[PDB]
């Protein structure tokens, strides 16, 4: 069995290997990369996403989100308070202000320590989930707006044509902006490209051990767990590496830098934080190996998770027994 300890693997494809996206994902899986839940892909030196980032300041962040924490430093939830619209140039200035800028630090490990010590005492503002793309249309390799769609994959594997679309999203971050513990909708893959700026630290639980994280989360968030049998779908709970280690939960960590891709694999729980002002692009995708995970994915039906239009067909076709309850939660 390849990668039996479920370590995060780092790949360096050549320019020839960077042509065929599906083939390279399957290659990484042949080497056991999915066992970690997360892999890093460093593009060949010949590749670029676009020519420059000099002209992005007028992008609008219609609904910036202030991430307010409750709990203790290692075990907390966050809610998202909506703020007034601002441009990416305005948001960048805000991120660099004395109130929000990254503190002085020695290295990524010192900054990680500072994040976990101090996160709860601040409320950073995240420009998340903005439909759009920063890949140039002429970039033919690993262009996150030109991937094969999940609807086409379902149709190819199962024969059923469905409605829905699959487009990328932009994330503008600052110091301490946080992504809560989650797997993707319908336990899909994700791919995330860090276009510019400061790093993103990731934590990940191997898919084979996801239920250990879920059991811990029910213990640590007992009100939330009574409210919903899949409350991590709400994407609000944080648990620190120290707390995971104290509770014996298998996990790994890695820091993504600008110019690097990360892939999350089906049912790979992940969480993390941004080091300072940055911009990422991410999208969900599927492969044949996903279908079995999609059929078994948990679902939130309490009303909180509320998701895209395109998840309807995935539930309806893959999970017909659950569909009526799930759809009630959507309405
Ligand atoms: O970058 C972020 O805030 C969160 N991204 C992801 O969870 C992802 O790419 O799957
Ligand atoms: Mg612009
Ligand atoms: Ni994710
Ligand atoms: Zn729920």
Structural resolution in Å: 1.3
CATH of the domain at 326: 2.60.120.650
Give 41 Cα–ligand 3 centroid separation in angstroms. 16
Q: Is the CB of 290 under 6 A from ligand 1?
A: no
Q: Whose CA is nearest to atom 3 of ligand 1?
A: 179
Q: Is the CB of 278 under 6 A from ligand 1?
A: no
DSSP string, 234-269: G--EEE-HHHHHHTT---EEEEE-TT-EEEEPTT-E
Ligand with an atom nearest the CA of residue 326: 4
Ligand with an atom nearest the CA of residue 87: 2
Ligand with an atom nearest the CA of residue 279: 1
Nearest to 74 by CA among 243, 214, 204: 243
Q: Is the CB of 181 under 6 A from ligand 1?
A: no
Asked if 116 contacts 69 with a C-beta cutoff of 8 angstroms, the reply is no
Q: Is the CB of 179 under 6 A from ligand 1?
A: yes
What does the block give as tokens for 252? 């790994």
DSSP at 301? -
Nearest to 147 by CA among 187, 183, 191: 191
DSSP string, 146-203: SSPPHHHHHHHHH----------EEEEE-TT-EEEEEPPGGG-EEEEEEEEES-EEEE
Nearest to 113 by CA among 6, 5, 223, 241: 241
Answer positive or negative: Cα dihedral of 4, 6, 7, 8.
positive
Q: After which residues is the chain broken (C to N over 2.5 A)?
A: none
Position in ligand 1 atom list of the atom nearest CA 184: 10
Position in ligand 1 atom list of the atom nearest CA 173: 3
Nearest to 184 by CA among 292, 269, 303: 269
**Domain coverage including residue 260:** 1-331
The residues, ordered by sequence, that sit 6+ positions from 42 with a Cβ below 8 Å of its Cβ are: 10, 11, 12, 259, 260, 261
What does the block give as tokens for 218? 């029910």
Count structural domains, the chain: 1
Q: How was this structure determined?
A: X-ray
Query: What distance in Å separates the CA atoms of residue 137 and residue 56, rounded to the nearest whole number?
Result: 16
Element containing residue 273 per DSSP (H, E): strand 269-274
Query: What distance in Å separates the CA atoms of residue 200 and residue 210, rounded to the nearest whole number?
Result: 22
Position in ligand 1 atom list of the atom nearest CA 128: 3
Q: Give the count of beta carbons closer than 10 Å to the beta carbon of residue 102.
A: 17
């Amino acid at each position: 069995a390849q990668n039996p300890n479920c370590n995060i693997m780092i790949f360096h494809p050549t320019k020839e290997e960077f042509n065929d996206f599906d083939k390279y994902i399957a290659y990484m899986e042949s080497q056991g990369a999915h066992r970690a839940g997360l892999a890093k892909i460093i593009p060949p030196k010949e590749w670029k996403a676009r020519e420059t980032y000099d002209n992005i300041s007028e992008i609008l962040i219609a609904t910036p989100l202030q991430q307010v924490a409750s709990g203790r430093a290692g075990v907390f939830t966050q809610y998202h308070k909506k703020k007034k619209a601002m441009t990416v140039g305005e948001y960048r200035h805000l991120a660099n202000s004395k109130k929000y800028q990254t503190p002085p630090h020695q290295n990524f490990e010192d900054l990680e320590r500072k994040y976990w010590k101090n996160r709860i005492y601040n409320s950073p503002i995240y420009g998340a989930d903005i439909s759009g793309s920063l890949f140039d249309e002429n970039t033919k390799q690993w262009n996150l707006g030109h991937l094969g769609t999940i609807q086409d994959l379902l149709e190819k594997e199962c024969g059923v044509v469905i409605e829905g679309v699959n487009t990328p999203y932009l994330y503008f971050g600052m110091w301490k902006t946080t992504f809560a513990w989650h797997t993707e909708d319908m336990d899909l893959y994700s791919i995330n490209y860090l276009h510019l700026g400061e790093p993103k630290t990731w934590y990940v639980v191997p898919p084979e051990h996801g239920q250990r994280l879920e059991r811990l989360a029910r213990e640590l968030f007992p009100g939330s767990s009574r409210g919903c049998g899949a409350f991590l779908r709400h994407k609000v709970a944080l648990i620190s590496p120290t707390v995971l280690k104290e509770n014996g939960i298998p996990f790994n960590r890695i820091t993504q830098e600008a110019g690097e891709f990360m892939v999350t694999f089906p049912y790979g729980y992940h969480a993390g934080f941004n080091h300072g002002f940055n911009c990422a692009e991410a999208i969900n995708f599927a492969t044949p190996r996903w279908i079995d995970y999609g059929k078994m994915a948990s679902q939130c039906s309490c009303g909180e998770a509320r998701v895209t239009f395109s998840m309807d067909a995935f539930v309806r076709i893959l999970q017909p027994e659950r569909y009526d309850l799930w759809k009630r939660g959507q309405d």
